[PDB]
Design a protein around this ligand. Structure first.
Ligand SMILES: C[C@]1(C(=O)Nc2cncc3c2CCCC3)CNS(=O)(=O)c2ccc(Cl)cc21
Ligand SMILES: C[C@]1(C(=O)Nc2cncc3c2CCCC3)CNS(=O)(=O)c2ccc(Cl)cc21
Ligand SMILES: [Cl-]
Lengths: 305, 305
């Protein structure tokens, strides 16, 4: 038993991290086969960041302007191209440590592991979720740009995030591995703000089921509710609407604990209207929303990679 | 910006995990150079667990009774010896993926990363602390015995924990890599219970300094305290006594933020008395004690906001 915020083992991703330098900017790159993927803002100075014309900045660069370092070895750049907000550096050597991989775009509410890197060297791994407002509450300092988010499905690494920027509120924004930003963000030094965030309802419910599996049942009650009445309640507390898809997805956890999804919704309704009253759930005084229904099933079953 | 519970990148430890089988029992082993380290209870049946005579059970075993599997390869056992509660299996192949390593015994309050494994296969990584009562609040199911705790400051892996058992309250007990248990526990199914746990005061203080660094000061006050008056109050809330060593260790964080340790102790005294009043500190409604002074310096910026 026990319930922790758990990240995937990072080893398959550590073997892909490289350092990319162009001029005075140094950031992280992802080396898969003979290509290094990194944020295209590596070609910008602080003067350019105000209003960059990325194609115009890129046309002035040659292959030898990009310095790529893998461990203590210098990789030779033999080509370069831009795809959305990501730069693709063709290198001479294929990464012998390239794992089985896919590039996947995730949806808000989905979780992933972040391997925080500085100078192409991994320093930490943590778990987080794509918020409904498309930001992530990460932990990144200067030099972390190019750090990646991923999930592991059997032996295949699914890369879903590449770090690009920090917003004024201390939250983070980035792209998928095809360079498409999550959220209405741009890679420029301009006024940008995170939108009003909401709580991931299906994830809080999954975490309530995890608490029941771990022996925390004080919040259970005899009541049930309807999906229409619960959504009228949830909308008042800045919770995301719960759909029939979310109810279907919580089916296995409902069968394991014997608590119907709308039965658990009535517990969440009472927790939202009354609070915890000095109590905790899984060592937390807040309702936790960064564990998906699948994360809960995985952690309470022991799936390996 | 941001503050997350962050684990070390697990790759260097993933390349050491093996599966160890003796009869009907199967658990995890740590393969470093030509030795596999695993809990000695791998030689026990559930009938041997009440009063096992390990020396008598071990003398009846030969090298070929121990099945060690590394990935899809069978390792040949050429020797075996017991050191305290750990079994050391001499194998015929040195692990080519052996990182630079040390075995270190940690003290209560210290944090480390746990690579949870099943059948010699890593499933997840999380951060945790050695509680004052020598237990850890982990996430471990049946088959996780032999999973290890470690730190990776610089390029050297310091192994500090090997998982052995779950106590009746759902918390976990284990040994250092020399087989010495942390706490008054035994690898025996005896009526043993964790002592009453306490909050790691020096770690809560470190985490309050992390919140100041990230730009938050709502909890500070104009008061100070003597160390003894602070300890008289702290012990009423089940907080560990703060020693002069802890005050010395908080020196760097005190210098960076400009807040004297005994002044931060005064904010802590007031937080214990008043609660948070609807507010959070670094996204938490509870006072966090699983970040050491060293973890805060490692994660946080050197420039206070
Ligand atoms: C400076 C950069 C950025 O956010 N880097 C970064 C990323 N993560 C954390 C931290 C920073 C910087 C200092 C704090 C900590 C560069 N990326 S960008 O998308 O071009 C961009 C766009 C706009 C702005 Cl205002 C900054 C940036
Ligand atoms: C049975 C074992 C144990 O706790 N395994 C285990 C270890 N970690 C987690 C989980 C379990 C079990 C199922 C749930 C989850 C084996 N280790 S031991 O030190 O010999 C020991 C000592 C005392 C007792 Cl009461 C049991 C055990
Ligand atoms: Cl220590």
């Amino acid at each position: 038993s026990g319930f922790r915020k758990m990240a995937f083992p990072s080893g398959k991703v550590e073997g892909c991290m490289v350092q990319v330098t162009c001029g005075t900017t140094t950031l992280n790159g992802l080396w898969l086969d003979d290509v290094v993927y990194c944020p295209r803002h590596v070609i910008c100075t602080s003067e350019d960041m105000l209003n960059p014309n990325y194609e115009d900045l890129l046309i002035r660069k040659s292959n030898h302007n990009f310095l790529v370092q893998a461990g203590n070895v210098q990789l030779r750049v033999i080509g370069h191209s831009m795809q959305n907000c990501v730069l693709k550096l063709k290198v001479d050597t294929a990464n012998p440590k390239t794992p089985k991989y896919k590039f996947v775009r995730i949806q808000p509410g989905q979780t992933f592991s972040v391997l925080a890197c500085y100078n192409g060297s991994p320093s930490g791994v943590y778990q987080c979720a794509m918020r409904p407002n498309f930001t992530i509450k990460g932990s990144f300092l200067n030099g972390s740009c190019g750090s990646v988010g991923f999930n592991i499905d059997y032996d295949c690494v699914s890369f879903c995030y590449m770090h690009h920027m920090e917003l004024p509120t201390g939250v983070h924004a980035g792209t998928d591995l095809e360079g498409n930003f999550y959220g209405p963000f741009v890679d420029r030094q301009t006024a940008q703000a995170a939108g009003t965030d909401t709580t991931i309802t299906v994830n809080v419910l999954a975490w309530l089921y995890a608490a029941v599996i771990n022996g925390d049942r004080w919040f259970l009650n005899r009541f049930t509710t309807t999906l229409n009445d619960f959504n009228l309640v949830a909308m008042k507390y800045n919770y995301e609407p719960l759909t029939q898809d979310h109810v279907d997805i919580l089916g296995p956890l409902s069968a394991q604990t014997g608590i119907a999804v709308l039965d658990m919704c009535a517990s969440l309704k009472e927790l939202l209207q009354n609070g915890m009253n000095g109590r905790t759930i899984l060592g937390s005084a807040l309702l936790e929303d960064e564990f998906t229904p699948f994360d809960v099933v995985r952690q309470c079953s022991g799936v390996t990679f």
